[PDB]
Amino acid sequence: DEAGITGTWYNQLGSTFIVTAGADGALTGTYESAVGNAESRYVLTGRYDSAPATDGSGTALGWTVAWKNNYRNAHSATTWSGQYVGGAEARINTQWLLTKGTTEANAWKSTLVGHDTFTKVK
Amino acid sequence: DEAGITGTWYNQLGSTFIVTAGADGALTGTYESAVGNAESRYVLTGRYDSAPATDGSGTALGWTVAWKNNYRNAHSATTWSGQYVGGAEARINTQWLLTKGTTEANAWKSTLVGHDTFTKVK
Amino acid sequence: DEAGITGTWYNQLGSTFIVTAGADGALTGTYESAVGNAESRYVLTGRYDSAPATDGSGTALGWTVAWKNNYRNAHSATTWSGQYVGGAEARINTQWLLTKGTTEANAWKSTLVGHDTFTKVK
Amino acid sequence: DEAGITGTWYNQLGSTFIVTAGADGALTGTYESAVGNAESRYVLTGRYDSAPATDGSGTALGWTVAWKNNYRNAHSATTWSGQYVGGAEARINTQWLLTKGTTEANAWKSTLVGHDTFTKVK
């Protein structure tokens, strides 16, 4: 699904996920969040299953953004874990974990959890 | 925390996380899981906050492993999201999401969640 | 939101959530899952914020089902954590954790995570 | 495990979980959090598997606290999902989801995720 995954994707929040899937299982690109302490593009890297099952199952993948770029630093990182589902209306369905750097006293509230669905349109 | 993070880490399960932190915020290395449908090393990539807060807060980071290598393919990917906490007994405290490729009918049970703590010894 | 929450709700999977919100913050009712190792209704109990903010924010709530009834026992429990959002198309948006009873060796894979959205129609 | 679960438990944060397990699978009691926007005791309710497997597996359970009592209202609810593990050093190992009531604009950051381990001492 190298060609299926490679390109520009948009989630329900209007964030933009620009990704290249490599033959070797690599994901590289940029992420622009429509929400939160973020502006412009941030580097992302990740991995995907480059030899998925042929039984109609989705293709497992994940990637990370650390929320530091030349404009801002939100001292946090989000990882999206999900699967790519091919077809006429292709989707990447994910769950994510956003961890902020905290003191030990505040570590219990370090991590947000959510879910993003990415499509090729929007 | 380039030097602080770079090296070999072990979690509570006895898994081995070998990572290089780049000056640019990159994480690269390999992961060997002591449990599950895995053998030998798997490629990982991720990101960390290369300019963390100086108020005693941890350093946010995350990384991904897709569970395909030359030995096995478990048609799944795990993302760890966490923070590095420096000091005499340095730790990387994480939460993770493991997504398996599934049919649409089974998508509701696609994702496991857990928590791993990594230390420099063990 | 006692009256707002009380009633029959359906999620994206076609599961049926029948709930009574008490004046005291209690949730009681039954859950019928359209998927998984389940049949018929299971007891649920939970809590909601009975004096929510008046700034347009949702109403926080949660509930638990242990997957044992007179028909089956799936040796597991799901907790839904979310908020009720009132209005013409009322919704309860949730994230959930499903823990299975496991041996210590398998504890790392004990917990599934997902997200369900409940509406008054469907 | 009615007798095994019933009693007073403490987590790693120093929070106090006082619970009665009913013959029917009910959990009732109070929770006092050592951290966050909380003081004194809050009502909890939940469910557990009252007929667990006899193969050495843990006992699945979950419970909810809405963070409103006579002292404070943090417009949020936490659900703990986990398993009870009996023996000389009994434990309840959990993962939790804390949802705050939010506006629709802030719904993406409504939910914290964490993990608490409860023991009979501490």
Tab-separated table of C-alpha atoms in Angstrom:
chain	number	residue	atom	x	y	z
A	1	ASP	CA	0.000	0.000	0.000
A	2	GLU	CA	2.943	2.299	-0.637
A	3	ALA	CA	0.945	4.274	-3.243
A	4	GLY	CA	-2.288	3.958	-1.223
A	5	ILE	CA	-0.776	5.608	1.862
A	6	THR	CA	1.523	8.165	0.222
A	7	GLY	CA	-0.063	11.604	-0.124
A	8	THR	CA	-2.027	14.227	1.746
A	9	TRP	CA	-4.638	13.288	4.322
A	10	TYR	CA	-7.030	15.355	6.412
A	11	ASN	CA	-8.684	14.516	9.738
A	12	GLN	CA	-11.997	15.544	11.296
A	13	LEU	CA	-10.352	18.584	12.933
A	14	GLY	CA	-8.992	19.865	9.599
A	15	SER	CA	-5.396	18.884	10.362
A	16	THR	CA	-3.133	18.012	7.401
A	17	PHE	CA	-1.008	14.859	7.368
A	18	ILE	CA	1.478	14.725	4.505
A	19	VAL	CA	3.219	11.379	4.290
A	20	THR	CA	5.528	9.293	2.100
A	21	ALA	CA	5.455	5.518	2.562
A	22	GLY	CA	8.797	3.912	1.680
A	23	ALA	CA	9.323	0.450	0.189
A	24	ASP	CA	11.122	-0.474	3.421
A	25	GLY	CA	8.160	0.276	5.764
A	26	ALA	CA	9.174	3.876	6.556
A	27	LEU	CA	6.770	6.788	6.993
A	28	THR	CA	8.182	10.324	6.622
A	29	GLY	CA	6.470	13.671	6.210
A	30	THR	CA	4.923	16.595	8.005
A	31	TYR	CA	1.906	17.271	10.207
A	32	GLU	CA	-0.006	20.521	10.580
A	33	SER	CA	-2.508	20.599	13.425
A	34	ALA	CA	-5.649	22.731	13.139
A	35	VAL	CA	-5.909	22.771	16.967
A	36	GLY	CA	-3.764	23.177	20.078
A	37	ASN	CA	-0.397	24.809	20.714
A	38	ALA	CA	0.821	24.404	17.151
A	39	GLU	CA	1.500	26.374	14.009
A	40	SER	CA	2.792	25.443	10.587
A	41	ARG	CA	4.333	22.043	9.865
A	42	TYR	CA	6.117	19.591	12.215
A	43	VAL	CA	8.350	16.697	11.244
A	44	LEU	CA	6.850	13.226	11.533
A	45	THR	CA	8.314	9.773	11.235
A	46	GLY	CA	6.768	6.344	11.587
A	47	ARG	CA	6.411	2.804	10.281
A	48	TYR	CA	3.813	0.732	8.448
A	49	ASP	CA	3.337	-2.958	7.603
A	50	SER	CA	4.730	-3.141	4.051
A	51	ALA	CA	3.465	-6.715	3.503
A	52	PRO	CA	-0.071	-6.760	4.950
A	53	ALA	CA	-2.502	-9.671	5.037
A	54	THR	CA	-4.482	-10.393	1.851
A	55	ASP	CA	-7.726	-11.339	3.636
A	56	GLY	CA	-9.350	-7.880	3.513
A	57	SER	CA	-7.672	-6.720	6.728
A	58	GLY	CA	-6.347	-3.171	7.098
A	59	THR	CA	-2.680	-2.190	7.107
A	60	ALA	CA	-1.212	-1.417	10.545
A	61	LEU	CA	0.819	1.777	10.937
A	62	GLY	CA	1.909	4.474	13.348
A	63	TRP	CA	3.793	7.739	13.511
A	64	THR	CA	5.091	10.374	15.925
A	65	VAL	CA	5.167	14.167	16.005
A	66	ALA	CA	7.174	16.047	18.637
A	67	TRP	CA	5.548	19.463	18.875
A	68	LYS	CA	8.726	21.510	18.377
A	69	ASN	CA	9.451	23.426	15.197
A	70	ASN	CA	10.978	26.816	14.328
A	71	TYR	CA	7.854	28.660	15.569
A	72	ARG	CA	6.795	26.969	18.793
A	73	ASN	CA	7.579	24.266	21.297
A	74	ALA	CA	4.621	22.705	23.145
A	75	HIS	CA	6.929	20.285	25.065
A	76	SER	CA	4.841	17.316	23.995
A	77	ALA	CA	4.668	14.446	21.521
A	78	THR	CA	1.729	12.664	19.898
A	79	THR	CA	1.819	9.133	18.539
A	80	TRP	CA	-0.948	7.918	16.236
A	81	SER	CA	-1.504	4.157	16.060
A	82	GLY	CA	-3.929	2.817	13.482
A	83	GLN	CA	-4.684	1.132	10.229
A	84	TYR	CA	-5.056	2.137	6.614
A	85	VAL	CA	-8.211	0.870	4.923
A	86	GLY	CA	-8.058	1.032	1.131
A	87	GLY	CA	-10.865	1.474	-1.404
A	88	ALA	CA	-13.020	4.127	-3.055
A	89	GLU	CA	-13.129	6.117	0.151
A	90	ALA	CA	-9.769	5.240	1.679
A	91	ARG	CA	-9.317	5.951	5.379
A	92	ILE	CA	-6.653	5.860	8.053
A	93	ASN	CA	-8.378	5.181	11.383
A	94	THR	CA	-6.271	6.002	14.411
A	95	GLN	CA	-6.096	6.309	18.134
A	96	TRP	CA	-3.495	8.644	19.603
A	97	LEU	CA	-1.576	9.377	22.800
A	98	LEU	CA	-0.280	12.913	23.472
A	99	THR	CA	2.309	13.063	26.256
A	100	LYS	CA	3.460	16.363	27.708
A	101	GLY	CA	6.721	16.788	29.610
A	102	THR	CA	5.736	17.141	33.285
A	103	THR	CA	7.203	17.263	36.753
A	104	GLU	CA	7.013	13.968	38.662
A	105	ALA	CA	4.174	15.457	40.785
A	106	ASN	CA	2.094	16.048	37.628
A	107	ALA	CA	3.014	12.854	35.766
A	108	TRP	CA	-0.426	11.362	36.461
A	109	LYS	CA	-1.943	13.989	34.113
A	110	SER	CA	0.780	13.841	31.443
A	111	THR	CA	-1.130	11.958	28.744
A	112	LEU	CA	-4.189	12.738	26.591
A	113	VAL	CA	-5.890	10.052	24.500
A	114	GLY	CA	-8.065	10.530	21.442
A	115	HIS	CA	-9.030	9.245	18.034
A	116	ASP	CA	-8.582	10.752	14.551
A	117	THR	CA	-9.950	9.522	11.226
A	118	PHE	CA	-8.080	10.639	8.111
A	119	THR	CA	-9.513	10.784	4.594
A	120	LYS	CA	-8.158	11.936	1.225
A	121	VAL	CA	-10.782	14.678	0.924
A	122	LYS	CA	-11.530	17.549	3.376
B	1	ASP	CA	19.022	15.119	26.374
B	2	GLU	CA	20.611	13.670	23.254
B	3	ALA	CA	23.227	11.811	25.348
B	4	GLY	CA	20.692	11.045	28.108
B	5	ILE	CA	18.326	9.235	25.732
B	6	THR	CA	20.833	7.579	23.389
B	7	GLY	CA	21.659	3.998	24.365
B	8	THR	CA	20.113	0.717	25.404
B	9	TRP	CA	17.007	0.584	27.565
B	10	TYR	CA	15.060	-2.297	29.071
B	11	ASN	CA	11.408	-2.454	30.142
B	12	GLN	CA	9.598	-4.442	32.831
B	13	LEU	CA	8.950	-7.295	30.367
B	14	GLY	CA	12.658	-7.625	29.501
B	15	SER	CA	12.290	-6.039	26.063
B	16	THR	CA	15.315	-4.175	24.640
B	17	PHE	CA	15.003	-0.682	23.171
B	18	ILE	CA	18.131	0.505	21.382
B	19	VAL	CA	17.891	4.132	20.353
B	20	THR	CA	19.917	7.031	18.950
B	21	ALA	CA	18.638	10.552	19.608
B	22	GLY	CA	19.677	12.980	16.859
B	23	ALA	CA	20.443	16.684	17.280
B	24	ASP	CA	17.421	17.379	15.062
B	25	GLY	CA	14.851	15.592	17.303
B	26	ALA	CA	15.037	12.216	15.517
B	27	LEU	CA	14.862	8.820	17.217
B	28	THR	CA	16.218	5.804	15.295
B	29	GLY	CA	17.067	2.295	16.422
B	30	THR	CA	15.726	-1.171	17.020
B	31	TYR	CA	13.267	-2.873	19.356
B	32	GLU	CA	13.307	-6.475	20.535
B	33	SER	CA	10.182	-7.608	22.354
B	34	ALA	CA	10.415	-10.285	25.050
B	35	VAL	CA	6.696	-11.071	24.518
B	36	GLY	CA	4.136	-11.556	21.751
B	37	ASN	CA	4.423	-12.502	18.088
B	38	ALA	CA	7.961	-11.205	17.708
B	39	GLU	CA	11.524	-12.379	17.335
B	40	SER	CA	14.824	-10.587	16.952
B	41	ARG	CA	15.027	-6.860	16.228
B	42	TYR	CA	12.519	-4.544	14.478
B	43	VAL	CA	13.184	-1.107	13.048
B	44	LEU	CA	11.908	1.843	15.059
B	45	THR	CA	11.679	5.528	14.334
B	46	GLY	CA	10.343	8.417	16.370
B	47	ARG	CA	10.772	11.971	17.617
B	48	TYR	CA	11.665	13.723	20.863
B	49	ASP	CA	11.598	17.311	22.158
B	50	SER	CA	15.202	18.431	21.568
B	51	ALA	CA	14.747	21.683	23.542
B	52	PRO	CA	12.774	20.694	26.661
B	53	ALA	CA	11.663	22.941	29.509
B	54	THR	CA	14.253	23.777	32.189
B	55	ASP	CA	11.805	23.655	35.122
B	56	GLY	CA	12.415	20.006	36.085
B	57	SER	CA	9.843	18.680	33.611
B	58	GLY	CA	10.475	15.497	31.619
B	59	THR	CA	11.272	15.354	27.911
B	60	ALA	CA	8.367	14.311	25.663
B	61	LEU	CA	9.014	11.619	23.053
B	62	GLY	CA	7.457	8.835	21.028
B	63	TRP	CA	8.315	6.084	18.593
B	64	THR	CA	6.775	3.404	16.379
B	65	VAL	CA	7.536	-0.233	15.605
B	66	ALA	CA	5.736	-2.074	12.802
B	67	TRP	CA	5.989	-5.748	13.702
B	68	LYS	CA	7.427	-6.929	10.375
B	69	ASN	CA	11.022	-8.035	9.974
B	70	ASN	CA	12.844	-10.797	8.067
B	71	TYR	CA	11.547	-13.470	10.491
B	72	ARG	CA	7.904	-12.661	11.164
B	73	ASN	CA	5.032	-10.350	10.390
B	74	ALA	CA	2.435	-9.829	13.145
B	75	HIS	CA	0.432	-7.353	10.972
B	76	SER	CA	0.479	-4.767	13.734
B	77	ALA	CA	2.207	-1.605	14.919
B	78	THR	CA	2.907	-0.242	18.399
B	79	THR	CA	3.460	3.409	19.224
B	80	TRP	CA	4.966	4.387	22.573
B	81	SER	CA	4.227	7.905	23.822
B	82	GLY	CA	6.024	9.127	26.920
B	83	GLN	CA	8.666	11.167	28.609
B	84	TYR	CA	12.305	10.774	29.517
B	85	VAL	CA	13.148	11.607	33.124
B	86	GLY	CA	16.857	12.170	33.715
B	87	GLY	CA	18.941	11.593	36.850
B	88	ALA	CA	20.760	8.876	38.779
B	89	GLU	CA	18.090	6.365	37.876
B	90	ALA	CA	16.970	7.663	34.491
B	91	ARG	CA	13.637	6.411	33.179
B	92	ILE	CA	11.473	6.595	30.090
B	93	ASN	CA	7.841	6.270	31.200
B	94	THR	CA	5.446	5.395	28.411
B	95	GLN	CA	1.957	4.467	27.434
B	96	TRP	CA	1.472	2.529	24.212
B	97	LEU	CA	-1.136	1.667	21.585
B	98	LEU	CA	-0.804	-1.564	19.564
B	99	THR	CA	-3.033	-1.647	16.482
B	100	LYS	CA	-3.526	-4.824	14.485
B	101	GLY	CA	-4.738	-4.864	10.884
B	102	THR	CA	-8.357	-6.081	11.026
B	103	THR	CA	-11.431	-6.504	8.890
B	104	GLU	CA	-14.017	-3.730	9.281
B	105	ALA	CA	-16.195	-6.159	11.315
B	106	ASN	CA	-13.363	-6.610	13.849
B	107	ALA	CA	-12.118	-3.009	13.918
B	108	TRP	CA	-13.667	-2.453	17.358
B	109	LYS	CA	-11.080	-4.879	18.818
B	110	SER	CA	-8.103	-3.662	16.764
B	111	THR	CA	-6.223	-1.785	19.488
B	112	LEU	CA	-4.474	-2.811	22.727
B	113	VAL	CA	-3.322	-0.227	25.273
B	114	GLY	CA	-0.625	-0.607	27.898
B	115	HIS	CA	2.219	1.030	29.748
B	116	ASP	CA	5.973	0.311	29.749
B	117	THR	CA	8.685	1.793	31.962
B	118	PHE	CA	12.228	1.691	30.590
B	119	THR	CA	15.413	1.874	32.655
B	120	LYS	CA	19.126	1.673	31.823
B	121	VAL	CA	19.589	-1.475	33.915
B	122	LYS	CA	17.734	-4.833	33.621
C	1	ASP	CA	-29.298	16.548	32.438
C	2	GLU	CA	-31.173	13.809	34.265
C	3	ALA	CA	-33.917	13.788	31.590
C	4	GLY	CA	-31.393	14.396	28.781
C	5	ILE	CA	-29.363	11.286	29.639
C	6	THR	CA	-32.144	8.928	30.742
C	7	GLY	CA	-33.371	6.649	27.957
C	8	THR	CA	-32.206	4.354	25.197
C	9	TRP	CA	-29.060	5.073	23.217
C	10	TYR	CA	-27.430	3.320	20.280
C	11	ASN	CA	-23.787	3.339	19.167
C	12	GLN	CA	-22.136	2.997	15.759
C	13	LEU	CA	-21.943	-0.801	16.169
C	14	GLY	CA	-25.693	-1.097	16.842
C	15	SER	CA	-25.263	-1.775	20.560
C	16	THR	CA	-28.086	-0.672	22.899
C	17	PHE	CA	-27.399	1.322	26.062
C	18	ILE	CA	-30.421	1.677	28.328
C	19	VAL	CA	-29.772	4.038	31.204
C	20	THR	CA	-31.475	5.874	34.069
C	21	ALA	CA	-29.744	8.966	35.453
C	22	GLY	CA	-30.578	9.538	39.128
C	23	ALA	CA	-30.861	12.901	40.889
C	24	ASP	CA	-27.864	11.849	42.997
C	25	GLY	CA	-25.452	11.325	40.042
C	26	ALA	CA	-26.124	7.584	39.631
C	27	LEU	CA	-26.307	5.738	36.313
C	28	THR	CA	-28.099	2.359	36.261
C	29	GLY	CA	-29.334	0.226	33.392
C	30	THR	CA	-28.412	-2.441	30.901
C	31	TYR	CA	-26.096	-2.828	27.919
C	32	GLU	CA	-26.537	-5.108	24.925
C	33	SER	CA	-23.510	-5.403	22.665
C	34	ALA	CA	-23.970	-6.051	18.943
C	35	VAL	CA	-20.401	-7.454	18.798
C	36	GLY	CA	-18.029	-9.722	20.716
C	37	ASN	CA	-18.571	-12.517	23.224
C	38	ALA	CA	-21.933	-11.229	24.401
C	39	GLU	CA	-25.626	-11.957	24.188
C	40	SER	CA	-28.690	-10.296	25.637
C	41	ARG	CA	-28.456	-7.627	28.335
C	42	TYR	CA	-25.748	-7.026	30.986
C	43	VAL	CA	-26.036	-4.934	34.123
C	44	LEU	CA	-24.327	-1.549	34.067
C	45	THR	CA	-23.670	1.030	36.726
C	46	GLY	CA	-21.909	4.371	36.614
C	47	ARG	CA	-21.844	8.032	37.593
C	48	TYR	CA	-22.388	11.398	35.928
C	49	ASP	CA	-21.826	15.053	36.869
C	50	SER	CA	-25.283	16.086	38.123
C	51	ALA	CA	-24.353	19.798	38.300
C	52	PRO	CA	-22.399	20.495	35.090
C	53	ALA	CA	-20.910	23.793	33.954
C	54	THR	CA	-23.271	26.304	32.307
C	55	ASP	CA	-20.746	27.546	29.721
C	56	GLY	CA	-21.767	25.177	26.899
C	57	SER	CA	-19.477	22.383	28.102
C	58	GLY	CA	-20.575	18.740	27.986
C	59	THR	CA	-21.525	16.640	31.002
C	60	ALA	CA	-18.861	14.164	32.164
C	61	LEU	CA	-19.937	10.577	32.835
C	62	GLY	CA	-18.816	6.969	32.886
C	63	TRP	CA	-20.102	3.457	33.388
C	64	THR	CA	-18.993	-0.169	33.655
C	65	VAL	CA	-20.229	-3.485	32.283
C	66	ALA	CA	-18.781	-6.789	33.498
C	67	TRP	CA	-19.453	-9.258	30.702
C	68	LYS	CA	-21.154	-11.913	32.844
C	69	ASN	CA	-24.871	-12.596	32.692
C	70	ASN	CA	-27.093	-15.700	32.788
C	71	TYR	CA	-26.046	-16.688	29.234
C	72	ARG	CA	-22.308	-16.101	28.993
C	73	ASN	CA	-19.203	-15.001	30.819
C	74	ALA	CA	-16.458	-13.351	28.734
C	75	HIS	CA	-14.248	-12.794	31.844
C	76	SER	CA	-13.867	-9.121	31.014
C	77	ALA	CA	-15.142	-5.654	31.875
C	78	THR	CA	-15.533	-2.499	29.790
C	79	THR	CA	-15.597	1.021	31.179
C	80	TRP	CA	-16.840	3.887	29.017
C	81	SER	CA	-15.622	7.375	29.931
C	82	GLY	CA	-17.133	10.337	28.125
C	83	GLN	CA	-19.435	13.282	27.975
C	84	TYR	CA	-23.057	13.923	27.143
C	85	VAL	CA	-23.651	16.734	24.661
C	86	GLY	CA	-27.236	17.987	24.631
C	87	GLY	CA	-29.254	19.533	21.795
C	88	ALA	CA	-31.321	18.619	18.745
C	89	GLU	CA	-29.020	15.726	17.980
C	90	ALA	CA	-27.879	14.748	21.463
C	91	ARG	CA	-24.779	12.573	21.717
C	92	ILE	CA	-22.729	10.722	24.292
C	93	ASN	CA	-19.126	10.628	23.052
C	94	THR	CA	-16.967	8.049	24.775
C	95	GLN	CA	-13.660	6.308	24.928
C	96	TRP	CA	-13.543	2.853	26.485
C	97	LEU	CA	-11.165	0.349	28.073
C	98	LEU	CA	-11.974	-3.388	27.943
C	99	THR	CA	-9.892	-5.462	30.359
C	100	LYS	CA	-9.874	-9.244	30.208
C	101	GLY	CA	-8.816	-11.449	33.115
C	102	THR	CA	-5.373	-12.815	32.177
C	103	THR	CA	-2.459	-14.741	33.587
C	104	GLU	CA	0.464	-12.573	34.721
C	105	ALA	CA	2.400	-13.690	31.592
C	106	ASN	CA	-0.367	-12.284	29.353
C	107	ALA	CA	-1.151	-9.145	31.365
C	108	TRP	CA	0.586	-6.952	28.775
C	109	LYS	CA	-2.225	-7.796	26.305
C	110	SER	CA	-5.104	-7.583	28.800
C	111	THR	CA	-6.631	-4.284	27.674
C	112	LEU	CA	-8.368	-3.089	24.487
C	113	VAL	CA	-9.092	0.598	23.877
C	114	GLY	CA	-11.712	2.095	21.597
C	115	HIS	CA	-14.258	4.827	21.095
C	116	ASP	CA	-18.070	4.705	20.835
C	117	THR	CA	-20.489	7.496	19.942
C	118	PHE	CA	-24.068	7.083	21.154
C	119	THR	CA	-27.124	8.788	19.672
C	120	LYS	CA	-30.862	8.618	20.389
C	121	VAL	CA	-31.632	7.274	16.911
C	122	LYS	CA	-30.221	4.130	15.198
D	1	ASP	CA	-13.327	-12.990	45.025
D	2	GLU	CA	-15.984	-11.101	46.956
D	3	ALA	CA	-13.857	-11.196	50.142
D	4	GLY	CA	-10.614	-10.722	48.171
D	5	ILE	CA	-11.789	-7.452	46.605
D	6	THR	CA	-13.813	-5.995	49.484
D	7	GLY	CA	-11.827	-3.573	51.639
D	8	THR	CA	-9.482	-0.621	51.490
D	9	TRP	CA	-6.912	-0.267	48.733
D	10	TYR	CA	-4.203	2.300	48.074
D	11	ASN	CA	-2.539	3.276	44.790
D	12	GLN	CA	0.933	4.579	43.952
D	13	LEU	CA	-0.258	8.190	44.368
D	14	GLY	CA	-1.575	7.535	47.896
D	15	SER	CA	-5.233	7.608	46.852
D	16	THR	CA	-7.700	5.513	48.897
D	17	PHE	CA	-10.199	3.179	47.236
D	18	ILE	CA	-12.790	1.771	49.623
D	19	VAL	CA	-14.940	-0.871	47.989
D	20	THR	CA	-17.573	-3.520	48.718
D	21	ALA	CA	-17.952	-6.359	46.214
D	22	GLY	CA	-21.499	-7.753	46.170
D	23	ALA	CA	-22.507	-11.357	45.479
D	24	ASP	CA	-24.282	-10.076	42.358
D	25	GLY	CA	-21.162	-8.515	40.728
D	26	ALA	CA	-21.690	-4.999	42.133
D	27	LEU	CA	-18.928	-2.669	43.314
D	28	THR	CA	-19.903	0.191	45.660
D	29	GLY	CA	-17.806	2.485	47.814
D	30	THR	CA	-15.840	5.694	47.911
D	31	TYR	CA	-12.680	7.108	46.355
D	32	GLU	CA	-10.366	9.739	47.797
D	33	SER	CA	-7.766	11.089	45.394
D	34	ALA	CA	-4.399	12.283	46.706
D	35	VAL	CA	-3.989	14.432	43.553
D	36	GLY	CA	-5.946	16.777	41.292
D	37	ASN	CA	-9.057	18.887	41.811
D	38	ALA	CA	-10.452	16.708	44.576
D	39	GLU	CA	-11.001	16.640	48.305
D	40	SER	CA	-12.529	14.117	50.662
D	41	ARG	CA	-14.507	11.122	49.409
D	42	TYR	CA	-16.490	10.657	46.158
D	43	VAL	CA	-19.101	8.021	45.423
D	44	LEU	CA	-18.034	5.157	43.178
D	45	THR	CA	-19.926	2.346	41.542
D	46	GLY	CA	-18.805	-0.455	39.266
D	47	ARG	CA	-18.940	-4.129	38.346
D	48	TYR	CA	-16.692	-7.175	38.598
D	49	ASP	CA	-16.711	-10.728	37.207
D	50	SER	CA	-18.251	-12.698	40.095
D	51	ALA	CA	-17.462	-16.088	38.493
D	52	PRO	CA	-13.906	-15.751	37.136
D	53	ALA	CA	-11.854	-18.386	35.337
D	54	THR	CA	-10.103	-21.011	37.490
D	55	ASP	CA	-6.935	-21.186	35.358
D	56	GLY	CA	-4.900	-18.626	37.339
D	57	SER	CA	-6.296	-15.665	35.397
D	58	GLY	CA	-7.156	-12.389	37.134
D	59	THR	CA	-10.669	-11.126	37.818
D	60	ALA	CA	-11.897	-8.380	35.466
D	61	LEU	CA	-13.498	-5.295	37.013
D	62	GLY	CA	-14.152	-1.600	36.575
D	63	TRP	CA	-15.608	1.398	38.345
D	64	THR	CA	-16.475	5.069	37.878
D	65	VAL	CA	-16.077	8.228	39.944
D	66	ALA	CA	-17.732	11.493	38.901
D	67	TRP	CA	-15.687	14.220	40.559
D	68	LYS	CA	-18.602	16.009	42.242
D	69	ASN	CA	-19.204	15.882	45.974
D	70	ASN	CA	-20.332	18.358	48.653
D	71	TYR	CA	-16.957	20.175	48.543
D	72	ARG	CA	-15.993	20.470	44.888
D	73	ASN	CA	-17.011	19.762	41.331
D	74	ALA	CA	-14.201	19.153	38.813
D	75	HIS	CA	-16.716	18.539	35.956
D	76	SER	CA	-15.056	15.249	35.094
D	77	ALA	CA	-15.336	11.491	35.522
D	78	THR	CA	-12.705	8.756	35.751
D	79	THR	CA	-13.285	5.115	34.895
D	80	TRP	CA	-10.780	2.485	36.011
D	81	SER	CA	-10.703	-0.761	34.025
D	82	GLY	CA	-8.564	-3.605	35.310
D	83	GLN	CA	-8.149	-6.904	37.024
D	84	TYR	CA	-7.794	-8.157	40.564
D	85	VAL	CA	-4.888	-10.534	41.129
D	86	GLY	CA	-5.165	-12.511	44.361
D	87	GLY	CA	-2.424	-13.922	46.597
D	88	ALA	CA	-0.021	-12.945	49.369
D	89	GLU	CA	0.456	-9.530	47.831
D	90	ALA	CA	-2.926	-8.973	46.204
D	91	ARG	CA	-3.143	-6.258	43.562
D	92	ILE	CA	-5.694	-4.500	41.402
D	93	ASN	CA	-3.940	-3.401	38.202
D	94	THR	CA	-5.811	-0.769	36.240
D	95	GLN	CA	-5.803	1.594	33.341
D	96	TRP	CA	-8.036	4.652	33.537
D	97	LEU	CA	-9.725	7.285	31.379
D	98	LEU	CA	-10.545	10.717	32.858
D	99	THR	CA	-12.987	12.723	30.740
D	100	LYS	CA	-13.662	16.382	31.436
D	101	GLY	CA	-16.770	18.203	30.227
D	102	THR	CA	-15.608	20.432	27.350
D	103	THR	CA	-16.915	22.660	24.608
D	104	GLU	CA	-17.063	21.012	21.173
D	105	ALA	CA	-13.982	23.070	20.144
D	106	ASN	CA	-11.967	21.523	23.006
D	107	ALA	CA	-13.346	17.978	22.788
D	108	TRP	CA	-10.095	16.720	21.244
D	109	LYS	CA	-8.355	17.363	24.602
D	110	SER	CA	-11.175	16.082	26.830
D	111	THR	CA	-9.619	12.789	27.932
D	112	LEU	CA	-6.572	11.839	30.032
D	113	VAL	CA	-5.298	8.256	30.187
D	114	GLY	CA	-3.200	6.660	32.900
D	115	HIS	CA	-2.534	3.576	34.960
D	116	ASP	CA	-2.924	2.910	38.703
D	117	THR	CA	-1.848	-0.134	40.708
D	118	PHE	CA	-3.682	-0.736	43.982
D	119	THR	CA	-2.378	-2.769	46.916
D	120	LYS	CA	-3.708	-3.549	50.400
D	121	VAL	CA	-0.778	-1.800	52.087
D	122	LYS	CA	0.415	1.832	51.643
